[PDB]
Coordinates of C-alpha atoms in Angstrom, one line a residue:
Chain A
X1 CA 0.0 -0.1 -0.1
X2 CA 1.3 3.5 -0.9
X3 CA 0.4 7.2 -0.9
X4 CA -2.8 7.9 -2.7
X5 CA -4.4 4.4 -1.8
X6 CA -7.8 4.1 -0.3
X7 CA -8.2 3.7 3.4
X8 CA -11.4 2.9 5.2
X9 CA -12.5 3.6 8.7
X10 CA -15.8 2.7 10.3
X11 CA -17.4 5.8 8.9
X12 CA -16.0 6.2 5.4
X13 CA -13.1 6.3 2.9
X14 CA -10.0 8.7 2.8
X15 CA -6.6 8.3 1.2
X16 CA -3.3 7.3 2.6
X17 CA -0.8 10.4 2.7
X18 CA 2.7 9.1 3.2
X19 CA 4.2 6.0 4.8
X20 CA 6.5 7.2 7.5
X21 CA 8.4 5.8 10.4
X22 CA 10.3 6.4 13.8
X23 CA 13.1 3.9 14.6
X24 CA 11.3 0.5 13.5
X25 CA 7.9 1.7 14.0
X26 CA 5.8 2.3 11.0
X27 CA 2.9 4.5 10.6
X28 CA 0.9 6.5 7.9
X29 CA -0.1 10.1 7.7
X30 CA -3.6 11.3 6.5
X31 CA -6.1 13.9 7.0
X32 CA -6.9 15.0 10.7
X33 CA -10.7 15.1 9.7
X34 CA -10.4 11.5 8.7
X35 CA -8.7 10.3 11.9
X36 CA -11.1 12.3 14.1
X37 CA -13.3 9.7 15.7
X38 CA -11.8 6.8 13.8
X39 CA -10.0 3.9 15.7
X40 CA -9.4 1.1 13.3
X41 CA -8.3 1.3 9.6
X42 CA -8.8 -1.2 6.8
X43 CA -7.2 -1.6 3.3
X44 CA -10.6 -2.6 1.7
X45 CA -14.5 -1.7 1.8
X46 CA -15.0 -5.3 3.1
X47 CA -13.0 -4.5 6.0
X48 CA -11.1 -7.8 6.0
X49 CA -7.6 -6.5 5.6
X50 CA -6.5 -4.3 8.7
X51 CA -3.8 -1.8 8.5
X52 CA -3.7 -0.2 11.9
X53 CA -5.1 2.0 14.6
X54 CA -5.2 5.8 14.9
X55 CA -2.4 7.1 17.2
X56 CA -3.1 10.8 16.8
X57 CA -5.3 13.4 15.4
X58 CA -5.2 17.1 14.9
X59 CA -8.2 18.8 13.4
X60 CA -9.5 21.4 13.3
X61 CA -6.8 24.2 13.5
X62 CA -4.5 21.9 11.8
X63 CA -5.6 19.0 9.5
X64 CA -3.3 16.0 10.1
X65 CA -3.6 12.4 11.8
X66 CA -1.4 9.5 12.2
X67 CA -2.1 5.7 12.0
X68 CA 0.0 3.0 13.5
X69 CA 0.5 0.0 11.4
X70 CA -0.6 -3.4 13.2
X71 CA -0.6 -5.4 9.9
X72 CA 2.8 -7.1 9.6
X73 CA 2.6 -8.6 6.3
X74 CA 1.2 -5.7 4.1
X75 CA 3.9 -4.0 2.0
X76 CA 4.4 -0.4 3.3
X77 CA 6.0 1.3 0.3
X78 CA 7.8 4.6 0.8
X79 CA 6.1 6.1 -2.5
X80 CA 3.2 7.6 -3.9
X81 CA 1.7 5.0 -6.4
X82 CA 4.7 4.3 -8.5
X83 CA 6.7 7.6 -7.5
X84 CA 9.6 7.4 -5.0
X85 CA 9.5 9.9 -2.2
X86 CA 12.9 10.7 -0.5
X87 CA 12.4 13.7 1.4
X88 CA 10.1 16.5 2.6
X89 CA 10.0 20.2 1.9
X90 CA 8.3 23.3 2.4
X91 CA 5.8 24.6 -0.2
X92 CA 6.6 27.8 -2.1
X93 CA 4.4 30.1 -4.2
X94 CA 4.8 29.0 -7.9
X95 CA 5.9 25.5 -7.0
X96 CA 4.7 22.7 -9.4
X97 CA 3.1 20.1 -7.4
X98 CA 1.0 16.7 -8.0
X99 CA -1.7 15.1 -5.8
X100 CA -2.9 11.5 -5.8
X101 CA -6.2 10.6 -4.3
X102 CA -8.3 7.2 -4.1
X103 CA -11.2 8.8 -6.0
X104 CA -9.6 11.0 -8.8
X105 CA -6.2 9.5 -9.0
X106 CA -3.3 11.8 -10.0
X107 CA -3.7 15.6 -10.8
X108 CA -1.2 18.5 -11.1
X109 CA -1.1 22.2 -10.7
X110 CA 0.7 24.8 -8.7
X111 CA 0.9 26.4 -5.2
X112 CA -0.9 29.8 -5.4
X113 CA -0.7 30.9 -1.8
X114 CA 0.6 29.9 1.6
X115 CA -0.6 30.4 5.2
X116 CA -4.3 30.4 4.0
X117 CA -7.2 30.0 6.6
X118 CA -10.1 27.7 5.6
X119 CA -13.4 27.9 7.3
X120 CA -15.3 24.5 7.1
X121 CA -18.0 26.0 9.3
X122 CA -19.4 25.0 12.7
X123 CA -16.3 26.1 14.3
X124 CA -14.1 24.0 12.0
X125 CA -11.4 26.4 11.0
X126 CA -8.1 25.4 9.7
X127 CA -5.1 27.7 9.6
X128 CA -1.6 27.9 7.8
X129 CA -2.9 26.0 4.6
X130 CA -1.2 25.7 1.3
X131 CA -3.6 26.9 -1.5
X132 CA -3.3 25.3 -4.9
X133 CA -5.2 25.2 -8.3
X134 CA -5.2 21.5 -8.1
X135 CA -8.7 19.7 -8.1
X136 CA -9.9 17.1 -5.5
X137 CA -13.1 15.2 -4.8
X138 CA -14.7 13.2 -1.9
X139 CA -12.6 10.3 -1.0
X140 CA -9.3 12.3 -2.0
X141 CA -8.8 13.6 1.7
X142 CA -5.5 12.9 3.3
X143 CA -3.9 12.0 -0.1
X144 CA -0.3 13.2 -0.8
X145 CA 0.7 16.4 -2.5
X146 CA 4.2 16.0 -3.7
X147 CA 6.8 17.6 -6.0
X148 CA 9.1 15.2 -7.8
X149 CA 10.5 13.0 -4.8
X150 CA 9.6 15.6 -2.3
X151 CA 6.6 15.3 0.2
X152 CA 4.8 18.5 0.5
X153 CA 1.4 18.2 2.0
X154 CA -1.9 16.3 2.8
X155 CA -5.1 17.0 1.1
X156 CA -7.7 18.7 3.4
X157 CA -10.5 20.2 1.2
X158 CA -11.6 22.9 -1.0
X159 CA -14.0 23.7 -3.8
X160 CA -15.0 22.9 -7.3
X161 CA -14.2 19.5 -9.0
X162 CA -11.9 17.8 -11.5
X163 CA -14.1 18.4 -14.5
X164 CA -14.7 22.2 -14.1
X165 CA -11.4 22.8 -12.2
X166 CA -11.1 23.7 -8.5
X167 CA -9.1 25.1 -5.5
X168 CA -7.6 22.6 -3.0
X169 CA -5.9 23.5 0.4
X170 CA -3.4 21.2 1.9
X171 CA -1.7 20.8 5.3
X172 CA 1.9 21.2 5.1
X173 CA 3.6 17.8 5.8
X174 CA 6.5 19.3 7.6
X175 CA 4.4 20.3 10.5
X176 CA 3.1 16.7 10.9
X177 CA 6.5 15.1 10.7
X178 CA 7.7 17.5 13.4
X179 CA 4.7 16.8 15.6
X180 CA 5.1 13.1 15.6
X181 CA 8.8 12.8 15.4
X182 CA 8.5 10.7 12.3
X183 CA 10.2 10.9 8.8
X184 CA 9.4 9.7 5.3
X185 CA 11.4 7.0 3.6
Chain B
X1 CA -29.4 15.9 6.7
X2 CA -30.2 19.6 7.0
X3 CA -28.5 22.1 4.6
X4 CA -29.4 25.4 6.6
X5 CA -25.9 26.3 7.3
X6 CA -25.1 26.4 3.5
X7 CA -23.7 27.3 1.4
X8 CA -20.1 26.9 2.6
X9 CA -17.1 28.0 0.6
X10 CA -15.1 24.8 1.1
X11 CA -15.7 21.1 1.9
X12 CA -13.4 18.4 3.4
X13 CA -13.0 15.5 0.9
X14 CA -13.9 12.4 3.0
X15 CA -16.1 9.8 1.3
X16 CA -19.5 9.1 3.0
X17 CA -22.1 9.2 0.1
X18 CA -25.5 10.3 -0.4
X19 CA -28.0 9.8 -3.2
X20 CA -29.7 12.9 -4.6
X21 CA -33.1 13.2 -6.4
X22 CA -31.1 13.7 -9.6
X23 CA -29.6 10.3 -9.3
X24 CA -26.2 11.6 -8.7
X25 CA -24.2 10.1 -5.9
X26 CA -22.8 13.1 -3.9
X27 CA -19.5 12.3 -2.0
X28 CA -20.5 13.8 1.4
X29 CA -23.0 15.9 3.1
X30 CA -21.1 19.2 2.5
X31 CA -20.9 18.4 -1.2
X32 CA -24.5 17.5 -1.4
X33 CA -25.7 20.6 0.6
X34 CA -23.6 23.0 -1.6
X35 CA -25.4 21.4 -4.7
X36 CA -28.9 21.8 -3.1
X37 CA -28.0 25.6 -2.7
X38 CA -26.7 25.9 -6.1
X39 CA -30.1 24.3 -7.2
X40 CA -31.7 27.0 -5.6
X41 CA -33.4 24.4 -3.3
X42 CA -34.7 22.0 -6.1
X43 CA -32.4 19.2 -5.3
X44 CA -33.6 16.7 -2.5
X45 CA -32.2 13.7 -0.7
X46 CA -33.4 10.4 -2.2
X47 CA -31.5 8.1 0.3
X48 CA -28.2 7.6 2.1
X49 CA -25.4 5.6 0.4
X50 CA -24.6 5.7 -3.2
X51 CA -27.5 5.8 -5.9

């Protein structure tokens, strides 16, 4: 399983962000709004292949979460689909980026703004977001935003769709890596 | 599902589908409610889950 692949909780489906680790402990990052209120995660809709259990969740304000792998046999590739990821970096205005999600697959675009505030309503406000002109749709939450072999962010939300075009906001991955003391590989 | 607090300028992208009266599966409640608004209140909920 790798970045962009589907992940299922008891409530719905999101996408895996990046596979990360600390020492010899493996986890995966995804969106905080996906980990919020979720305990167990499965690799399939049938819920027959377990992945692991939620170890941390930060949403709203931020939008990241981390899941500790409990499945010992499933391959945990340090890639996004076929793409190798070797490091993480900070987004910059004008940066060419690519997102992969379990619903829409792979789409590209550019970073159009930094430190954006997104109000999802009902007091669910997230800050410090990366704004882009990349589209995304339901099911793509938590998927990776990368640039070549560099990990950049996690899909949070936005407007529009892939047919008409849209605006998607991402949580900077550097912040999540620091919070949990993990790193990509 | 009530769409009173809509529209909303943005939605999170988790997948928990709803089936609209237009036979389109809406990916989540925020997505569905924004469409209802855009439809000037003509779109309604058929049932929960995919169409």
